[PDB]
Design a protein around this ligand. Structure first.
Ligand SMILES: Nc1ncnc2c1ncn2[C@@H]1O[C@H](COP(=O)(O)OP(=O)(O)OP(=O)(O)O)[C@@H](O)[C@H]1O
Ligand SMILES: Nc1ncnc2c1ncn2[C@@H]1O[C@H](COP(=O)(O)OP(=O)(O)OP(=O)(O)O)[C@@H](O)[C@H]1O
Ligand SMILES: Cc1cn([C@H]2C[C@H](O)[C@@H](COP(=O)(O)OP(=O)(O)OP(=O)(O)O)O2)c(=O)[nH]c1=O
Ligand SMILES: Cc1cn([C@H]2C[C@H](O)[C@@H](COP(=O)(O)OP(=O)(O)OP(=O)(O)O)O2)c(=O)[nH]c1=O
Ligand SMILES: Nc1ncnc2c1ncn2[C@@H]1O[C@H](COP(=O)(O)OP(=O)(O)O)[C@@H](O)[C@H]1O
Ligand SMILES: Nc1ncnc2c1ncn2[C@@H]1O[C@H](COP(=O)(O)OP(=O)(O)O)[C@@H](O)[C@H]1O
Ligand SMILES: [Mg+2]
Ligand SMILES: [Mg+2]
Lengths: 679, 679
């Protein structure tokens, strides 16, 4: 057993009752000197390194050719000037095991952490050598972490797509079903996570032409999709809760499900308008609808109509066919299934669209794997082979997360937010997906990005603030207000600089101005003095600054239809020495076995004198956590991946009381505690 | 229990030891007077009938509008002038239960047998009122029976496609696989039987781009197709025996197969070049090949190269990857699987192409469900969404069968063959399949039809000739030579009349003349005197008549790339009072239960003084049956659906000796004893 693993395990051998937290500094030092340095290829110079990496098909050539090699050396030297040292064993282990470029034979290390960062920065900057330096500092200071698809792939040949998260609409025809199968496979082949909205497909037992009772329904298309994802080397189906197939749709995922209906590689999500929550509260028998009878009567997809306005009219219309269900029992079934599998991802549709800026394009109808992407979409119609198709708007989103601790300590909320936006904008403009025409069309038209945040709990716990406290909410309220301020400002700056807005921007609430109403009348500076001290050195936007930004946007518009969403953070959380996303930590010390050895990872910053503040999520009040997320969500235009942390000693009514409380507080999406759609 | 069922069962109550065969004449009379006539809607006139059937969306309007109603009445009266009476209970039962148009509520009969025939004839004739009369007589005399898809659908609204048999090529890309899934569903939705050639897909464990060992292989695409056919309301996959996946391909159909690999709605067929049969005979270890390594080396699909020429070169080429197998044991496995399921349909590829007329277009590479369609094909390439596709040639075939007994008694071999061709040509020209571009392109370019024959055994047994006798072969030799003569002659007549040939006709052996070599040097008039007497009244083509037809074709060409194939005959065999296809009868008397009653159907014409000639197939020598089929096959340009009739007391070596003997005798396809691809 290696020496770094020896010192690593010595954390768990207590001294004066205290753990040996300092042993992990030795462990990662031993891990480098006695291993990493000896398997890292070292060239006589950097040009020799880059020429080798280019000539051996490791790196791409075009993006490097935009720089004079004297500039590439300055950028690399900027990365190494930091003298970055991983503070823990698992942080360095995860980077070299998951991210560092290895040789084709997987024997030696080609990239140090400074190398991957320099290459990504050279890619983002697109020739601007000083900007490349800015990106290097931003990443080497660990202020910003682009998503794994971007951070891992930028600058490679054989490089996968930098975006790997996609959402698809599916129209109610065999032609469209066939095209969705192929698109799913085309994206999944590229490593993408694909979520499809099935709410427009007619329900089981609806007519085809004049043959009554002919349709397989949603479960039939799920079976085809399940197989498509199996063949092409993870997908999701969403369904509106008022769709007649909702029960059958859910039952495909019961762990006891019969194999005739079983679907094994599809996640599921459920879309819940306010009207359903009211019916459930009142314990009144509800109706679910056969969507094609609604289409034949109203000429519109049920999915494109306002169920809060239309429910009673659908019920009274004799040409609309429906079924009676028990809304409380359906709500209970959603709790049971999430205890089994985490998902169904639950989306409170009216909590999304109440504050949605682009309802003029469409209401938000569904979300992605792990349910943080919330954007408008419009269904295509792929017609017969000899006819032109009608290309709509699907969704793809490009992700990154700033690191709250390092942003606060560097007092760089503005600079990080604006710079990270520039990078996500570059990934959006260099993406051209083939074989997904509505994804490609939407990416150019909508120009949407998704900037998030990680290390919320870690930063709070290291500054003496409990995750569940009202002080924690007071910090989050202010911090994310500021993130949103500078995000909107940078999007308008890019719109002025380029002279473009996203397509149909002038119909958005950004252009008509009501987006800014709460920001010009309400102040979001800290109510607690000790929280205000954390922001010392950074100007906090006032209602007056918001009035001037409102006016600025009104003159120049905005480049991005969407800017912010908070995805989960996977392995990269280790590399960042950061608690995952904005969630509370799960364990104070993680024990995982790797290759016949047990490794220990205490939470980033865990000491004996802050033990109390690293409170484990399962011991927290989920109602207080809901309050925290609802506070962050005020200033995020898309969504927040939100996993409830529950003990098995929870009755099904306790579970639904959380659901109802989350809906009450304005939460957009929720599930219980996705690789392509995480940072 | 009804009276017709009473008299029907009285056949089986013997008199002087003899069955009561005459009781079935009473049964079908009782079946009409006491039931059929009372549930048949009778209008005051025919215009009242047709107007009702048009106005109630039963019939189509366009084809009837091509006639003046005085002419429609003459055509209908021509049908009724025959005073056609069904000679047996089951013949009338099958027509009214399976073919006669009933009301939307399925309560009363709208069509008598004379009505369906008149409508089909009016459809075929396309305005020519005298031709409509010719079609009426041809069908009411039961000289010709168009296939069930055509006979059932012609003249309807809500009418399904008149062709329902299709064959598809699939290219080696994800794009092509996705298009084949959709095409399969588009055709299957229309009621089609779809067979796909999977021999071009790269084998399991081949590279994708530069990722080695990445491919699922043929079984992966079979699983997708299996699901496609399940969703869209029967298909087939063919594979060349030299494909590396052949064993895995076969194992998907073992009745004991694990569900991870199980395929439940796909038939399978295997394509066997001569080189494999030689390797099996010699008991020499054979090789199967990874087709993509062959493609990367030779630039051609293994499926498009001559394995008899290339086998040793493939084996010696170090850049071609292969696997060793046991050819004898593989041949044995094909016998086992056919005992289980009937198929794998076995195709002896060189027995097809040795006598194939259009090798210049392509070799024949695969066949259909029940394996009688044998035509050239060329693979498409469906490229990325933004790029033009390359449309190749798939296959569809339009079927019918003449009734040998009635053709011989009416001495109408010429008139039936030429008239049936005209009808199959009309079905071909009125077919426009959407969403299958290579099927549509091939149908116009190739103009192929498939005329067959039924009632061979019945006709032989009723003229004192045993199915296994050399006299039976002597009759078949002459009869089908004549069918082929007048078929070729009518195809050339249509080519002169229209001034067109099928595309690239001048590369065929019809144009270069070697097709006719055996017909200008060998006489095919009967060797047996009693067989020659059967043809009295009809001129038998001589070598001189063939020389003049050869010259005729050389001047005018031919309209049809393919003309003849002998499909199985399903329920319509009853309606025709005909033994199935050209096969020997299976049972002298069929006992089947329908609705709590047992029905009896003795073979068409079975009497006590011809009992010996209705010898049951399972008591026959399959080697003599192979001889019979090989004799018919000389004069059929496509294939013959050929089911072996075997007792379970057959060793696996006995089974392979039949296979080897069938190959020896030139048989093209074979399996053991399809609805969309039967007449
Ligand atoms: N394999 C490598 N070998 C050498 N330098 C590398 C390598 N990988 C990255 N670098 C980085 O490239 C930069 C320049 O490296 P190089 O050794 O060519 O220059 P130097 O000797 O440090 O400086 P100067 O140009 O003044 O000689 C340094 O920041 C170094 O850390
Ligand atoms: N339901 C039906 N009622 C009447 N005739 C029918 C019907 N179905 C088919 N036919 C056929 O239509 C043809 C003409 O029928 P119709 O009764 O109108 O004429 P008709 O009285 O026999 O002759 P004519 O025109 O000299 O009066 C006949 O051959 C008849 O068998
Ligand atoms: C994408 C994909 C293809 N395949 C199959 C389908 C095809 O038979 C083959 C890949 O064909 P293609 O889709 O044509 O792949 P490619 O063009 O990117 O790469 P290459 O140049 O090597 O053709 O492998 C899989 O087995 N799994 C997959 O996920
Ligand atoms: C063809 C087919 C469709 N479907 C589904 C797919 C679609 O959701 C719907 C049929 O859509 P379509 O493919 O659009 O059918 P259509 O246009 O011929 O008929 P209609 O005018 O009624 O749309 O039913 C099946 O369930 N099984 C099938 O076999
Ligand atoms: N925690 C660490 N993170 C990153 N690199 C490390 C770490 N520990 C050691 N190394 C690498 O090992 C080299 C030798 O280690 P050492 O001599 O202890 O440090 P230094 O270079 O500061 O004197 C360092 O220059 C560095 O490249
Ligand atoms: N075997 C049969 N096939 C067809 N139709 C039949 C048959 N037997 C009876 N029918 C129908 O029943 C009608 C009345 O039968 P019947 O009086 O016995 O015959 P016919 O009309 O020759 O005198 C016939 O006109 C005919 O339409
Ligand atoms: Mg439709
Ligand atoms: Mg390819």
């Amino acid at each position: 057993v290696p020496k770094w693993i020896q010192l690593n395990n010595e954390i768990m051998i207590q001294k004066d009752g205290k753990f040996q937290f300092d042993k992990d500094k030795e462990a990662v030092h031993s891990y480098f000197v006695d291993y990493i340095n000896q398997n890292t290829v070292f060239f006589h110079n950097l040009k020799e390194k880059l020429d080798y990496l280019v000539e051996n098909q490791y790196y791409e050539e075009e993006f490097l050719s935009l720089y004079s090699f004297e500039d590439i050396k300055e950028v690399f030297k900027t990365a190494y000037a930091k003298k970055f040292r991983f503070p823990s064993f698992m942080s360095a282990f995860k980077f070299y095991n998951d991210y560092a470029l290895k040789t084709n034979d997987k024997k030696k290390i080609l990239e140090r952490y400074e190398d991957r960062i320099s290459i990504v920065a050279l890619f983002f900057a697109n020739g601007d050598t000083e900007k490349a330096k800015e990106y290097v500092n931003l990443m080497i200071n660990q202020e910003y972490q682009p998503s794994t698809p971007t951070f891992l792939n930028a600058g490679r040949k054989r490089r996968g797509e930098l975006v790997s998260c996609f959402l698809l609409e599916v129209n109610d025809s065999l032609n469209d079903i066939s095209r969705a199968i192929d698109i799913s496979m085309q994206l999944s082949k590229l490593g993408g996570g694909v979520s499809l909205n099935l709410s427009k497909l007619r329900a089981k037992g609806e007519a085809i032409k004049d043959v009554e009772n002919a349709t397989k329904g949603v479960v039939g298309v799920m079976k085809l999709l399940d197989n498509a994802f199996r063949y092409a080397d993870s997908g999701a189906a969403y369904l509106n809760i008022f769709h007649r197939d909702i029960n059958d749709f859910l039952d495909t995922k019961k762990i006891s499900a019969d194999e005739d209906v079983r679907v094994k590689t599809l996640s599921i999500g459920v879309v819940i308008p306010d009207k359903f929550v009211e019916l459930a509260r009142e314990d009144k028998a509800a109706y679910v609808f056969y969507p094609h009878t609604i289409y034949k009567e109203y000429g519109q997809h049920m999915d494109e109509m306002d169920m809060n306005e239309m429910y009673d009219k659908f019920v009274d219309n004799p040409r609309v066919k429906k079924e009676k269900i028990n809304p409380r029992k359906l709500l209970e079934k959603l709790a049971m299934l999430r205890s089994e599998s985490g998902y169904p991802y639950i989306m409170f549709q009216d909590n999304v669209n109440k504050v949605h800026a682009n309802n003029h394009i469409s209401k938000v109808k569904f979300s992605n794997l792990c349910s943080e992407v919330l954007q408008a979409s419009q269904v295509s119609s792929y017609t017969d082979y000899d006819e032109e198709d009608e290309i709509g708007l699907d969704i793809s989103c490009n992700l990154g997360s700033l690191n709250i601790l390092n942003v606060m300590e560097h007092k760089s909320i503005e600079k990080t937010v604006k710079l990270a936006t520039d990078s996500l904008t570059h990934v959006s403009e260099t993406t051209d997906i083939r074989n997904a025409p509505a994804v490609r069309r939407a990416n150019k038209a909508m120009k949407s990005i998704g900037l998030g945040a990680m290390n919320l709990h870690g930063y709070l716990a290291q500054n003496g603030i409990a995750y569940e406290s009202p002080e924690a909410r007071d910090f989050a309220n202010t911090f994310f207000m500021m993130v949103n301020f500078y995000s909107i400002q940078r999007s308008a700056e890019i719109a002025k600089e380029k002279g473009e807005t996203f397509d149909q921007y002038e119909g958005s609430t950004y252009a008509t101005g009501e987006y800014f109403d709460k920001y010009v009348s309400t102040d979001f500076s800290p109510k607690y003095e000790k929280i205000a001290n954390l922001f010392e050195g950074m100007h906090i936007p006032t209602t007056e600054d918001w009035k001037k930004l409102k006016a600025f946007v009104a003159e120049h518009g905005m480049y991005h239809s969407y800017r912010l969403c908070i995805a989960p953070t996977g392995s990269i959380s280790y590399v960042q020495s950061s608690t995952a996303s904005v969630m509370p930590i799960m364990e104070r010390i993680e024990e995982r076995t790797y290759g016949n050895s047990k490794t220990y990872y205490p939470m980033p910053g865990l000491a004996s004198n802050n033990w109390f503040f690293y409170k484990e999520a399962y011991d927290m009040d989920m109602f207080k956590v809901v309050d925290m997320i609802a506070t962050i969500q005020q200033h995020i235009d898309q969504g927040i991946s939100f996993t409830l942390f529950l003990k098995d000693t929870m009755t099904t009514r306790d579970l639904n009381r959380i659901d109802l409380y989350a809906h009450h507080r304005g939460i957009k999406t929720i599930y219980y505690a996705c690789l392509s759609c995480v940072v």
